[PDB]
């Protein structure tokens, strides 16, 4: 019984303490890691037992198997690897200390082991200990944080101990971010840090978190995006900047959303969105190949017991135009794109949503109705990497008008395995038009839209100093790690995901 | 010229270009070569040269416009911290009529594209001779100094002050160095929550916010420390995170409410081991970035006192209580008595006698810290480890091996400022609880910075955290001392400003 | 004296082996190069002595200078760099060992130094020895043809020499990366041939005993490269040695290095452009500029800057020859007649242009171009459209009868490149071989042998292709301002 | 069916007719827009039945096959760059119907052609170009084999490369080996250098040289056996790290693993010893196999395709055996003390052992040669995985430094892989007096009989008198490495134009 186990084991190590036995020693000198030990001694023959090499290793006891009173086997784990400790009475510093030490040890315990390399008749690489030291006891009975999702996510440390697939997803997450940095560093992007607390949040349509600063007596918002700060640096004459950082959205959690999440944004002066499409294909495909070995990954939309898809990251990625493809999916013609800002188009998209059973919680604005329709008809068909391009201006308040198609913008979004990955556009750099677009956002806000943008006059002022033609880009790191690890739940790729209380 | 007037006039001029179909903000200008690479490629031309056979496109911002007789205009084109002269005469331009038209259009501050031939003036100034200039983005204001202005419009600061970009390149090299140093040592770069039901890991006043879908309060993190230790329990022996933290407190020359730290945790290490990796990282960082192990610093501004600071290892070490007794000329209580009300009174009397301020609450930890700040930390010009902090100041640090009442802790001080905080980690779950219970008592007796009880973290400790040592470093603070900046606002792109 | 020194030093060294003090120890562990030591401690100040740290360095002693009896300065050199050893008795292992090592050491000796970084009051970066170990004694007294016969002395004493060879090797690395990026395959073809071919030159002959068979050293890789193009490898290159049995002079060595490359579907116009891109990019990248200063008459002569900015000047051989002569030559379609040989012979006599026998059209013509055209070529200059009578492997010119699609690059008066659209018609190639063989039979030692399995390969279909070959040694000469090729060969052929 | 000699006669006469009629069967210039490789990459996404009227491109290649399908439809199998593209020649898409039959009537398998036309894909999903115009660039006057015969493959490599794509891939592997080594050495600061291939005195190895004569200088010259001595003279010059990848020449017999000119990489590293070099060799060889191959494991067919297949594991560290101890173990008997390996007695002992063990050794039956035959028989043959054979006797190693603890031995190793010697390395002998005595012992042997023994090199000994720093050097056969990385048992497989016994 777990609770009784805890009471018993807690009382025992408490006894060790008051009697001065030091169950939490300060320092154990490790000579070699378990990984290096296995690399250096795997070549031994079964039955071997080295007399001229003694080493100190450490790890956690995963299993304790008695073989008579004279012989115990410890399954010792660390670094994603394992090493057997063959504790034989005859090789220990003394037979009485052998009994004493092994009677204390339990599964879960962190230990230090001083011993000789060996291999059993079976051929299991082992260390035969002269001395075993308890470094940290485990006061709890470990799961025979095992399969129950909830326990795994609330106690990630148990998950990481018991399930090596979990450690592997977090390694690849680190490689994603590291790959992106060298990719951008090599292209001359300067890595920067902009404020995560804003008097006025910006850079996206989203509901922010609000705080208060006592000394300065002001309310602050947690950032939605670093976008506006980045463009001000480009006005400043830093032509290539990027930031990999946390963004915060005051919204609900589900399979693809956490209230804090990581993105990479970058801004490149003298680029347009066509250039970013090629950079994107290059970065994403190079990234998949680098870490997984090929351009093809397997996709299980329905878990391990469902259909398996091979997703091909070989460039170039498919491109669809948002308004055209939607009309095709609808089998019906939408208004001319120059009419996408009229109330009548709004009514038309509203009627279409009712008729097609596409829900849209209030406000039923053109932007939100459009996005719901695109989510239903286009996004779900994006298995392979696909750019959805040319977003209407009404859904894109900071993108530059498209140069040949009235009412549209130079904007794309990358979709992979039904999930949005990147959002990019050539940047709106006309201050008068940016201001008019902010004002529309402000009136939507005043009319009951929690997510609408605040007018940022200080940013419009910066645009009045001259933002060179620029293209910028934003990628959700968590989303990429999801698809590179074939995870359908974002909680798989965050170490400590946000959780219902 | 009234700037308001200039703005109003240029705004009109540019509105007119839009209504004339002369789009002043074009979509795409194809730059063939950066200014930096243009300079390095043609840097060996001779005075008077004009390579009519090669044609390139460059771009940048106009920093000066200077006419010279209606058929010859020079634009000082800048970019990437560098300059190139545009020498435009009408003979070489696409058209004489187009030549007049573009010059009448352009102004100082405008971003432009230049298509033209490499060349050099008889004076020996590298130049490009334009066939065509394109307005890419007009500057609607007249361009200009004083700190306020530079910090509130960092883009102006960056355009006019070249030293500014340089400080920020130093900062990004600091960070790239640390990642590279740690990655080589097999540390895994990770990300832990910046929003917590319970903030912990430091002594600090947190920001609080509200998540309405879950109907619950959340604190912005003050440190990632407890999360990192839970990852060590889970068998990731070495982790680090370079990330923002948040503190609801006053701004000053060394404090911003949000700031960047590197924290790392390595199993099987103790604080002595960390003293060694710290010397190698900081010393090697200083040398790699500034070419030398020596940095001169100006606490009193330019034309002030100028200490030369020596980052050669080993760093000097001092014991907190031992040295405080010396700096003071008196014997303090024995370290095993630091929990008593008698000690607090002794410490309080001292602070009154030496005129050391200590806002309420006047607790032992707070009185000590004030005393150490004025007696020890001021003397730390060269990198100096202050070690062996009392336990009442270090609720998450492991007890000292031999000195009762002390802990295995150090702080790294450079130029009178705290850079690092590190210790052998407390891994005994029952001892950690006791120490949280005292933090919660301190919080209820007036201390806004005192820690909350984190039972979930205490539970993690009950599974078995191996002996471990952890470390935290203020990146902004490193940036300050590697750029000779006395104000943290110099090393933050957009520092927090009073409204 | 030198002979005495040798004899005395040899006995001293011999005495050390017999005293169990091995003057040639097996292994000295070097902690840090001299170059890195200098980069690491450039920030020290006068009087500094980092007793904290102890490094091991190594080098050749260039000077031994004792002040008193408890202090000595060794000028340690290595890697084109130098470091002062400040040996003093108080810091050395012991006073007894300090005298012993100093009595033992001499100028020239290779030594290992274990010590602390430091600086003298005078400001010189130093290492202060705990211990100095003799690594390899120099048994001789240290000090153009002396430099060339003992290139190891030259390299010890003249810092400029290693810099030229570093440039030489940078030239070659650059050419491999240029061609590798263009998709060329780096290959290796035989240097020993039954029939030598691919150039007009006199070959070396040797004998393979096992096979009882005469073999020639290659004069060019060209025919094998073309056989690779027939085989479907569209782009091949080889940077290797060629051998010619001929006299030495300022620009000629009996063995030398060429880069040759062949590209299918190219002609000599495409290769002119690649030549400009490669040579100009090479000059700019190595030196730092497209301009190189050239001293034709040594350092105490006139200096003319040479401009490697593309495009290079082009001259047509026959058109410019006619102008530099101030006279009309035979029509280019009459170049195989006996009349025109006599015309050309007469012109060489009238202009005092030497031409040793055989006085054939191809040789009379080459002499004339050498003296009238090639001397004007200081800036990189292409000489184009060579007559067919001097170009047996080149494809005929498609507009000018008698000429071929050929060029040679000239830089600072000397031939650097030879390139052309390749002849790929096997019957025409055979014809031209047959005429080479008649030239051979009539006095010309450089004339080609008939290579019938090359003509057989051409019968399978060589695609239209263009080939190119550059003398690497001559590129090194003009990039190091050397007028003597012995300057850019480590071990040049010496009489 | 037509006979090869007749086919050649007929095709030659036809091509000659084109020439005299002014028809241009060998045009100067065809502009190629795109390579077959880029065409395939750019257009493979097309769907079956597709035909772009939107893109016109010019490609080129050699006809591998010509198959009619009616009279108005011809399929050409076009090959280049190790790759393949179908030319769907359709009468109705060609520039005209009369020009269509005219061009196809003259084209044959083997011909080099240029093709202008549109991308397309057949119903079967076969990527094609649909020509508007096909141009003969170069006719093939011979029938191509309708191949496997080694001798034809090696005497006419251009055919082997045309017909057998496994052959291109071997030579690609070989270029990657060489390119890998340069980057490895350059990155460690080695200076790539070139030293004389013609020597007044050859040296640097025991081998029989080629001899030639320089007329102008009236001098006999030898082709180089090894660059070794020139390299060590550069290390005395203060160039601490030098390497050279170049041709060596040996006047000896040809067989499965020997060509009379072959390629080695030699490098010298000042302040290194042969232990340092074992570690670098492991690093280099194991990284090279993984880089080129994808893993540390390679398959080895000692007996050809239809024989046993061994996995050879290049995972470091490599096995080490000491030459003399392992030899005694294989013999099951004790040899003389290593300090006795220079005596006549020891020679007689080795001679008797060779007779008794059926180990042949042609004259001269010297100790070095008898030991080497015994090591070949009993040790080298067992080296399948990369194996260092170590600490050769001084009598076999005239240029290697004596061993620091084992009298009679040297600090030398050789790397064997799949039964073949790959590398030869040692701590260099830098004592000029000992070097000179070792040369005189070689010269004594030369005058006694063996034409492989070394010449005394007094210029080199003089260089050693100026001080050669302690150094280790290293020599590797590129051809040998290329053999084992492509699983070839015959060196002819990895030389473009191997030496061959006369016609
Ligand atoms: N003996 C030599 N030494 C060095 N380089 C040579 C030698 N012979 C020829 N070359 C170089 O090799 C290149 C191609 O060989 P080619 O047969 O055209 O030489 P070449 O015309 O005989 O040279 P030159 O006229 O200088 O004697 C030449 O352009 C030249 O750069
Ligand atoms: N979390 C600490 C830094 C690391 C302390 C050592 N575990 C702080 O904020 O001060
Ligand atoms: Ca979306
Ligand atoms: Ca989006
Ligand atoms: Ca502090
Ligand atoms: Ca602190
Ligand atoms: Ca010549
Ligand atoms: Ca010539
Ligand atoms: Ca020539
Ligand atoms: Ca051998
Ligand atoms: Ca050998």
Asked if A touches C (at least 3 Cβ pairs < 8 angstroms), the answer reads no
Q: Identify whether residues C326 and C457 lie together within a single domain.
A: yes
Rounded Cα–Cα distance for residues A434 and A396 (Å): 11
List, in sequence order, every residue forming a beta bridge with D115; answer none if it has no partner: D59, D134
Rounded Cα–Cα distance for residues D218 and C248 (Å): 12
Tokens, residue D94:
């060609």
Domain boundary among C143, C164, C179: C143
Q: Half-sphere exposure (CA, 13 Å, Cβ side) for B196?
A: 23
Scanning D188-273, the segments in alpha helix (DSSP H) are: 228-236
Pick from C142, C78, C73: nearest CA to C102? C73
Q: How far is CA A260 from CA B209, B441, B496, in A?
A: 13, 32, 22
Q: Which of B44, B291, B292 minimises the CB distance to C288? A: B44
The SS3 assignment for B44 reads coil
CA dihedral angle for residue D322, residue D323, residue D326, residue D328, rounded to 10 degrees: -130
Tokens, residue D307:
């024989």
Q: Is C471 in the pocket of ligand 1 (CB under 6 A)?
A: yes
Strands A470-476 and A419-426: what pairing? antiparallel
State the CB neighbour count (10 A cutoff) for residue A321. Answer: 16
List, in sequence order, every residue forming a beta bridge with B424; answer none if it has no partner: B469
Domain boundary among C100, C117, C143: C143
Place of tokens 């500057």: B139
Q: Identify whether residues B180 and B119 lie together within a single domain.
A: no
Q: Is B426 in the pocket of ligand 2 (CB under 6 A)?
A: no
Burial level of A27, CB count in 10 A (0-12/13-18/19+)?
Answer: middle
Place of tokens 């920093």: B63
Rounded Cα–Cα distance for residues D218 and D199 (Å): 14
Host H or E run for residue A108: none
User: What CATH number does the domain containing B475 carry?
Assistant: 3.30.930.10
The SS3 assignment for A116 reads strand
Place of tokens 């291999």: A119
Atom of ligand 2 lying closest to residue B397 CA:
7
Q: How many residues does chain B have?
A: 499
Rounded Cα–Cα distance for residues B368 and B361 (Å): 12
Best substitution site from C436, C474, C483 to test ligand 1's pocket, by max atoms within 8 Å of Cβ?
C474
Judged by CB atoms closer than 8 Å, whether chains meet at C43 and B314 is answered as: no
Rounded Cα–Cα distance for residues C196 and C205 (Å): 9
What are residue D388's phi and psi, to 5 degrees?
A: -85, 120
- Is A477 marked within a binding site? yes
Pick from B137, B177, B146: nearest CA to B25? B137
What are residue B215's phi and psi, to 5 degrees?
A: 45, 70
Counted domains in chain C: 2
Rounded Cα–Cα distance for residues B466 and A23 (Å): 11
Rounded Cα–Cα distance for residues A123 and A120 (Å): 5
What are residue C377's phi and psi, to 5 degrees?
A: -95, 95
CB D318 within 8 A of CB D388: yes
Q: How far is CA B395 from CA B341, B409, B437, B451, D68, in A?
A: 18, 11, 10, 9, 89
The SS3 assignment for A425 reads strand
Scanning D310-343, the segments in alpha helix (DSSP H) are: 323-331
CB B201 within 8 A of CB B223: yes
Pick from D222, D245, D196, D264: nearest CA to D454? D222
Burial level of A343, CB count in 10 A (0-12/13-18/19+)?
Answer: exposed
Rounded Cα–Cα distance for residues D183 and B352 (Å): 70
Q: Which residues of B touch C50 (CB under 8 A)?
A: 312
Tokens, residue D208:
């029989």
What are residue D25's phi and psi, to 5 degrees?
A: -65, -15
CB C205 within 8 A of CB C231: no
Rounded Cα–Cα distance for residues A48 and D253 (Å): 48
CA dihedral angle for residue C269, residue C270, residue C272, residue C277, rounded to 10 degrees: 160
Q: Is C374 in the pocket of ligand 1 (CB under 6 A)?
A: no
Rounded Cα–Cα distance for residues D318 and C32 (Å): 28
State the CB neighbour count (10 A cutoff) for residue A201. Answer: 23
Q: Half-sphere exposure (CA, 13 Å, Cβ side) for C31?
A: 14
State the CB neighbour count (10 A cutoff) for residue A355. Answer: 10
Contact partners, residue C182, CB within 8 Å, separation at least 6:
C235, C274
**Ligand 2 centre distance from Cα of residue B274 (Å):** 13
Scanning D79-224, the segments in alpha helix (DSSP H) are: 97-106, 150-155, 157-163, 165-187
Host H or E run for residue A138: none
Q: Half-sphere exposure (CA, 13 Å, Cβ side) for A417?
A: 25
Q: Identify whether residues A133 and A32 lie together within a single domain.
A: yes
Beta strands (DSSP E) in C194-279 are 205-208, 213-217, 235-243, 255-264
Tokens, residue B284:
């090697």
Named by the residue before each, gaps in chain D exceeding 2.5 A from C to N are: 146
Pick from D499, D222, D198: nearest CA to C243? D198
**Inter-axis angle of helices A366-377 and A322-330, to 10 degrees?**
70
Dihedral sign computed on CA atoms, order B62, B64, B67, B68: negative
CA dihedral angle for residue A405, residue A406, residue A412, residue A413, rounded to 10 degrees: -130
Dihedral sign computed on CA atoms, order A52, A54, A55, A60: positive
Binding residues of C for substrate, by number, are: 198, 222, 260, 262, 418, 422
Q: Identify whether residues A227 and A142 lie together within a single domain.
A: no
Q: Identify whether residues C135 and C158 lie together within a single domain.
A: no
Host H or E run for residue C198: none
DSSP symbol at C332: G
The SS3 assignment for C220 reads coil
Tokens, residue B10:
């240029």
Q: Give percent helix, percent strand, percent coil of chain C, each to the nearest 5.
A: 35, 25, 40
Host H or E run for residue B295: strand B294-297
DSSP symbol at D394: G
CA B482 to chain centre: 10
Host H or E run for residue D420: strand D420-427
Q: Half-sphere exposure (CA, 13 Å, Cβ side) for B396?
A: 25
CB D451 within 8 A of CB D208: yes
Task: Put the strands of the sheet holding C192-193 in their side by side order.
Answer: C192-193, C213-217, C205-208
State the CB neighbour count (10 A cutoff) for residue B26. Answer: 15
What are residue A394's phi and psi, to 5 degrees?
A: -60, -25
Strands A240-248 and A190-191: what pairing? parallel
Rounded Cα–Cα distance for residues D411 and C430 (Å): 57
Q: How far is CA C367 from CA B215, C332, C356, C386, in A?
A: 98, 17, 10, 13
CB D485 within 8 A of CB D290: no
Contact partners, residue C305, CB within 8 Å, separation at least 6:
C291, C292, C293, C294
Pick from B303, B300, B357: nearest CA to B487? B300
Tokens, residue C78:
């290595």
Whether residue C376 has a cis bond before it, omega within 30° of 0: no
Q: Which of C110, C224, C464 minimises the CB distance to D137? A: C464
Q: Identify whether residues B458 and B478 lie together within a single domain.
A: yes
R_g over Cα of chain C:
29
Contact partners, residue A366, CB within 8 Å, separation at least 6:
A340, A341, A345, A346, A349, A392, A394, A395
**Ligand 9 centre distance from Cα of residue C426 (Å):** 23
CA C389 to chain centre: 30
* String of DSSP letters for D80-120: ETTEEEEEEEEGGGSS-HHHHHHHHHH--TT-EEEEEEEEE
Tokens, residue C479:
């990039």
Closest Cα to atom 2 of ligand 1: C252
Rounded Cα–Cα distance for residues D83 and B347 (Å): 86
Strands A411-416 and A386-389: what pairing? antiparallel
Rounded Cα–Cα distance for residues B449 and B455 (Å): 18
Q: What is the largest CA-CA distance in chain D?
A: 90
Q: Degrees (nearest 5) of the Cα angle C1, C5, C7?
A: 115
Q: Identify whether residues C124 and C157 lie together within a single domain.
A: no
Q: Identify whether residues B58 and B171 lie together within a single domain.
A: no
Pick from A67, A134, A145, A70: nearest CA to A106? A134
Q: Is C448 in the pocket of ligand 1 (CB under 6 A)?
A: no
Tokens, residue C375:
């001397």
Q: Identify whether residues C63 and C201 lie together within a single domain.
A: no
Place of tokens 């084209």: D107
The SS3 assignment for D124 reads coil
Strands D420-427 and D211-214: what pairing? unpaired
Q: What is the resolution of this structure in A?
A: 2.3
Minimal C-alpha gap between D77 and chain C (Å) = 15
Domain boundary among B109, B144, B179: B144
- Is D105 marked within a binding site? no
Q: Identify whether residues D262 and D321 lie together within a single domain.
A: yes
Place of tokens 């408490």: A14
Q: Which residues of C touch B120 (CB under 8 A)?
A: none
Strands A55-66 and A71-78: what pairing? antiparallel
The SS3 assignment for D300 reads strand
Place of tokens 């008898």: D370
Rounded Cα–Cα distance for residues B472 and A342 (Å): 55
Q: Identify whether residues A142 and A95 lie together within a single domain.
A: yes
Pick from B477, B484, B432, B478: nearest CA to B458? B432
* B448 φψ region: left (φ > 0), alpha (ψ -120 to 50), beta (else): alpha
Q: How would you label B358-368 residue by residue, b for 16+ Cβ within 10 Å and e otherwise?
A: beebbbbbbbb
Rounded Cα–Cα distance for residues D29 and C202 (Å): 33
Tokens, residue D193:
């250098």
Q: Which residues of C touch B293 (CB under 8 A)?
A: 43
DSSP symbol at C239: E
Q: How would you label B121-159 residue by residue, b for 16+ Cβ within 10 Å and e otherwise?
A: beeeebbbbbbbbebbbbbbbebeeeeeebbebbbbbbb
Rounded Cα–Cα distance for residues D361 and D347 (Å): 13
Rounded Cα–Cα distance for residues B38 and B56 (Å): 9
Q: Number of helices and strands (H, E) in chain A?
A: 14, 18
Burial level of C409, CB count in 10 A (0-12/13-18/19+)?
Answer: buried
DSSP symbol at A379: G
Contact partners, residue C474, CB within 8 Å, separation at least 6:
C251, C411, C414, C415, C416, C485
**Structure-determination approach:** X-ray
Place of tokens 């030291």: A133
CB C407 within 8 A of CB C474: no
Q: Which residues of C touch D196 (CB under 8 A)?
A: 255, 491, 493
CB D95 within 8 A of CB D61: no
List, in sequence order, every residue forming a beta bridge with A409; answer none if it has no partner: A401
Q: How far is CA B260 from CA A222, B176, D350, in A?
A: 16, 14, 75
Q: Identify whether residues B204 and B169 lie together within a single domain.
A: yes
Closest Cα to atom 4 of ligand 2: B472
Contact partners, residue C230, CB within 8 Å, separation at least 6:
C457, C458, C460, C461, C462, D158, D162
Pick from D426, D321, D301: nearest CA to D382? D321
CB A201 within 8 A of CB A250: no
Pick from A253, A205, A259, A198: nearest CA to A229? A198
Place of tokens 């993690």: B460
Contact partners, residue D5, CB within 8 Å, separation at least 6:
none
CA C286 to chain centre: 15
What are residue D433's phi and psi, to 5 degrees?
A: -70, -45
Judged by CB atoms closer than 8 Å, whether chains meet at B291 and C43 is answered as: yes
Rounded Cα–Cα distance for residues B184 and B327 (Å): 41
The SS3 assignment for A79 reads coil
What are residue C253's phi and psi, to 5 degrees?
A: -125, 145
User: What CATH number does the domain containing D129 carry?
Assistant: 2.40.50.140
Rounded Cα–Cα distance for residues C488 and C166 (Å): 10
Nearest chain C residue (CA) to D217: C495
Q: What is the residue range of A91's domain?
A: 2-146
Strands B384-387 and B316-319: what pairing? parallel
CB A437 within 8 A of CB A429: no
Pick from D270, D203, D234, D241: nearest CA to C153? D234
Tokens, residue A424:
């990019």
R_g over Cα of chain A:
29
Rounded Cα–Cα distance for residues D288 and A133 (Å): 43
CB D437 within 8 A of CB D320: no
List, in sequence order, every residue forming a beta bridge with D205; answer none if it has no partner: none
Rounded Cα–Cα distance for residues D147 and D164 (Å): 7
Host H or E run for residue A65: strand A55-66
Rounded Cα–Cα distance for residues B69 and D305 (Å): 85
């Amino acid at each position: 019984d777990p609770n009784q186990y805890y009471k018993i084991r807690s009382q025992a190590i408490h006894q060790l303490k008051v009697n001065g036995e030091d169950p939490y020693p300060h320092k154990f000198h490790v000579d070699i890691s378990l990984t290096d030990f296995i690399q250096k001694y795997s070549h031994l023959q079964p039955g071997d037992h080295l007399t001229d090499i003694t080493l100190k290793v450490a790890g956690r006891i995963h299993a304790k198997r008695a073989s008579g009173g004279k012989l115990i086997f410890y399954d010792l784990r660390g670094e994603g690897v394992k090493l057997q400790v063959m504790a034989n009475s005859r090789n220990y510093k003394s037979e009485e200390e052998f009994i004493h030490i092994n009677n204390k040890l339990r599964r879960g315990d962190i230990i230090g082991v001083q011993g000789n390399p060996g291999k059993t008749k079976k051929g299991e690489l082992s260390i035969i200990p002269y001395e075993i030291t308890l470094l940290s006891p485990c006061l709890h009975m470990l799961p025979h944080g095992l399969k129950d999702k909830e326990t795994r996510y609330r106690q990630r440390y148990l998950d990481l101990i018991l399930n090596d697939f979990v450690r592997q997803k977090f390694i690849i997450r680190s490689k994603i971010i590291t790959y992106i940095r060298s990719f951008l560093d090599e292209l001359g992007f300067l890595e920067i840090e902009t404020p995560m607390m804003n008097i006025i949040p910006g850079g996206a349509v989203a509901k922010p978190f609000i705080t208060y600063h006592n000394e300065l007596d002001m309310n602050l918002y947690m950032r939605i995006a670093p976008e506006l700060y980045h463009k001000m640096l480009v006005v400043g004459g830093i032509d290539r900047v990027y930031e990999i950082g946390r963004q915060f959205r005051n919204e609900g959690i589900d399979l693809t959303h956490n209230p804090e999440f990581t993105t990479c944004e970058f801004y490149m002066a003298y680029a347009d969105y066509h250039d970013l499409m090629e950079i994107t294909e290059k970065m994403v495909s190079g990234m998949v190949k680098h870490i997984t070995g090929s351009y093809k990954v397997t996709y299980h939309p329905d878990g391990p017991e469902g259909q398996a898809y091979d997703v091909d990251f070989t460039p170039p990625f498919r491109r669809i135009n948002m308004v055209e493809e939607l009309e095709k999916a609808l089998g019906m013609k939408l208004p001319e794109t120059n009419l996408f800002e009229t109330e009548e188009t709004r009514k038309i998209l509203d009627d279409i949503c009712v008729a097609k059973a596409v829900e849209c919680p209030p406000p039923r604005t053109t932007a939100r109705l459009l996005d719901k329709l695109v989510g239903e008809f286009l996004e779900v068909t994006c298995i392979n990497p696909t750019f959805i391009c040319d977003h209407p201006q009404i859904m894109s308040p900071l993108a530059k008008w498209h140069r040949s198609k009235e009412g549209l913008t130079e904007r794309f979004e990358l979709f992979v395995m039904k999930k949005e990955i990147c959002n990019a556009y050539t940047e709106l750099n006309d201050p008068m038009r940016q201001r008019q677009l902010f004002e529309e956002q402000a009136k939507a806000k005043a009319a009951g839209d929690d997510e609408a943008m605040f007018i940022d006059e200080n940013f419009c002022t910066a645009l009045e100093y001259g933002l060179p033609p620029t293209a910028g880009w934003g990628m959700g790191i968590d989303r990429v790690a999801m698809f590179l690890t074939d995870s359908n739940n974002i909680k798989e790729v965050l170490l400590f995901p946000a959780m219902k209380p």
